[PDB]
A paper describes a structure:
With only very few exceptions, cilia are built by intraflagellar transport (IFT), the bi-directional movement of proteinaceous material sandwiched between the microtubule (MT)-based axoneme and the ciliary membrane.
These helices organize into two tetratricopeptide (TPR)-like repeats, and are held in position via interactions with an extension of blade 6 of BP2. Although the fl IFT80 protein was crystallized (verified by mass spectrometry), the C-terminal 126 residues have no visible electron density and are presumably disordered in the crystal. BP1 adopts the fold of a canonical seven bladed β-propeller where the N-terminal residues contribute the first β-strand to blade 7, effectively closing the β-propeller by a zipper-like mechanism. Firstly, in the IFT80 structure, the most C-terminal β-strand of BP1 connects to BP2 as one long continuous β-strand. Inspection of the crystal packing of the IFT80 structure presented here revealed an IFT80 homo-dimer organized around a crystallographic 2-fold axis.
Author numbering: 1 to 8, 15 to 639
The structure:
């Protein structure tokens, strides 16, 4: 994918509302409205004041919108902070700072407004403009502030440093030196908890919430002047001197675009649906970017989302391409798998059998789709109104799993996982981190919710077999990898120093990054049975280093595709044999499996077969396998 860019003294601030209007604040002392086509529509207001920053009152869903929430706040150079309506009516003007107010953000729950001054103060206000508290007084201008999602913590920069402070508690403000120079912008994703920064050392960087560096860019020619997370948390944008870059959440860049005489891009804002962004530059021009050329593939099928109207389906059964009919509303979310293509527009969900593109099943959407997941039998669609929805591939809603205190706007693909019989959801709260399971038939809770002692980074369900086969992996914040069956549910630790893990597409096998090495478990369940045989069915490629923070993108057939932190996709061969053993054994062909193992004389396959045999209680076979293993010793 890439950023498709369109360009419209200084344009000081930009911000999209949930109605997909872009408001821009310029040094002409005017505020203008723009539409998603990147066209100017109206002068909304004119003020005797210069602008530095703006923020729309945050709305989780325009469907659950009702209230006086159609307002935005603007920071001014005279130190005032003004709340304006969508129509430009001044609701409230606040004398917030001495000298310019240079950054501000509404809390996510809308109960507070945070402002920061060149005077180095960070202040917290009620909407009534009352001073709620002075959070901080730094020794340098606080160029950028953002909230934690719970609104009990604020992240801000001062000098070279990033600071995280609690509003309620005191404890210890976490702080670190982020850049070798002045930090110019920060952002903190509420959905993936990652922090991004850019500054005068001419780099951008990605951090976790604890100050651990996850990515640092090479040198730009000039300071990085803005960074912004897409609401999806899967992408962020970077602005600089006549440049705009689109980055993966891992940090590496999809595209770097040179802009036409914009000066530095000082301000960034994304649309709520993460498909577009806007940037304000020192020149005063407004830049519009659209995320395009999304590529999906599954087996022989390749799908390219050309733009928000146009999709091509490439069916390489004979080097083919089919252009889908142009979409009547903007394409928002697309997913491919299991022989089906799902296209969610702003108002409709299309489900295509990829072999019969001419007859999709289509149903109405009443809210913005925020996630699509697919399994063999059905798929999952998420929005912030009805929440978690499980659909047949003919478009019939099967169930709507829910639980008290579920916050759907915080779920990404790391937090919720689907399979043929089970859904698992990470329920993250100040009180506790627990994994909750639900069945896909009725959406009813399955078993007792599982509590971990540490914060969890991500969870994922295995795909093969039945409910008794269903397993969850858990990676926690210490980078420990756990295995947890849905039904027997007794946890086991599989690895330390785990950066990633992925279930095999078609079998119970598991892959993971373990201290930067590729490790494969041919039979992960063995950990509950026999630690010694578990080790014999676990293979680590000792000499292949995937670097820091590598992410497994696919584990299927006999290959594992691994995305490195630097954006390089590595293809690693795994054993050609264990999937064949799985196939043979589900067909009860124990004779054939023993013959195969006798032919390849591979101790790890003998161990895998022995594990399979013991679980099936094929004792004759297990005996042969153990005999073969003990023989090579
Ligand atoms: O996505 C890819 O294959 C790449 O990195 O070129």
């Amino acid at each position: 994918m890439r950023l498709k860019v369109k360009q419209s003294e200084l344009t000081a601030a930009v911000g999209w509302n949930v109605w997909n209007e872009l408001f821009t604040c310029s040094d002409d002392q005017t505020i203008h409205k723009w539409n998603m086509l990147g066209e100017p529509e109206q002068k909304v207001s004119t003020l005797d004041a210069y602008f530095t920053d703006m923020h729309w009152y945050p709305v989780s869903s325009k469907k659950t919108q009702a209230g006086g929430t159609d307002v935005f706040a603007v920071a001014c150079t005279d130190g005032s902070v003004k709340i304006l309506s969508r129509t430009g009516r001044v609701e409230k003007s606040i004398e917030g700072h001495k000298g310019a107010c240079i950054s501000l953000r509404w809390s996510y729950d809308g109960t507070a407004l945070a402002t920061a001054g060149e005077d180095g103060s960070v202040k917290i206000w009620s909407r009534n403009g009352m001073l709620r508290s002075t959070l901080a007084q730094a020794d340098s201008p606080v160029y950028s502030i953002v909230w934690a999602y719970d609104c009990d913590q604020l992240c801000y920069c001062t000098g070279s440093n990033v600071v995280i402070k609690s509003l309620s508690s005191n404890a210890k403000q976490n702080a670190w030196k982020a850049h070798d120079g002045v930090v110019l912008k920060v952002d903190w994703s509420p959905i993936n908890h990652l922090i991004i920064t850019g500054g005068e050392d001419c780099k951008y960087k990605v951090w976790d919430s604890f100050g651990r560096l996850l990515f640092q860019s090479g040198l730009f020619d000039y300071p990085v002047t803005s960074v912004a997370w897409a609401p999806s948390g899967e992408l962020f944008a970077v602005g600089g001197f006549n440049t705009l870059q689109l980055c993966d959440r891992m940090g590496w860049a999809y595209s770097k675009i040179h802009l036409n005489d914009t000066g530095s891009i000082m301000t960034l804002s994304w649309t709520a649906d993460s498909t577009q962004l806007a940037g304000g530059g020192g020149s005063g021009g407004v830049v519009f970017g659209q995320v395009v050329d999304l590529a999906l593939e599954d087996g022989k099928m390749q799908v390219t989302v050309v733009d928000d109207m146009r999709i091509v389906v490439n069916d390489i059964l004979n080097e083919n391409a089919d252009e889908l009919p142009e979409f009547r509303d903007r394409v928002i979310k697309v997913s491919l798998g299991y022989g089906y293509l799902i296209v969610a527009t702003a108002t409709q969900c299309h489900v295509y059998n990829t072999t019969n593109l001419g007859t999709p099943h289509i149903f109405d959407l009443k809210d913005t789709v925020t996630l699509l997941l697919q399994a063999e039998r059905h798929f999952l669609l998420l929005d912030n109104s009805a929440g978690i929805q499980i659909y047949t591939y003919e478009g019939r809603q099967i169930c709507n799993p829910r639980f008290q205190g579920l916050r759907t706007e915080l779920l990404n693909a790391q937090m919720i996982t689907l399979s043929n019989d089970t859904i698992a959801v990470l329920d993250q709260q100040a009180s506790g981190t627990t994994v909750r399971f639900f069945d896909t038939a009725q959406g009813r809770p399955v078993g007792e919710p599982w509590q971990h002692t540490l914060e969890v980074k991500e969870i994922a369900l295995s795909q093969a077999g039945t409910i008794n086969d269903r397993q969850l992996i858990v990676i926690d914040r210490n980078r420990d990898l756990y295995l947890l069956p849905v039904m027997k549910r007794h946890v086991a630790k599989l690895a330390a120093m785990c950066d990633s893990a992925r279930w095999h597409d078609s079998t119970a096998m598991l892959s993971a990054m373990v201290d930067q090495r590729l490790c494969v478990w041919y039979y992960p369940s063995e950990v509950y049975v026999d630690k010694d045989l578990l080790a014999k069915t676990r293979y680590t490629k000792s000499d292949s280093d995937f670097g820091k923070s590598a992410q497994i993108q696919l584990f299927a057939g006999n290959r594992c595709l691994v995305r490195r932190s630097d954006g390089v996709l590595v293809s690693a061969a795994t054993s050609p044999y264990p999937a064949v053993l799985y196939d043979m054994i589900r067909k009860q062909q124990w004779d054939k499996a023993t013959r195969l193992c006798r032919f390849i004389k591979d101790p790890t396959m003998w161990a895998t077969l022995a594990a399979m045999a013991m679980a099936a209680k094929e004792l004759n076979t297990a005996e042969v396998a153990f005999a073969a293993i003990d023989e090579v010793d």
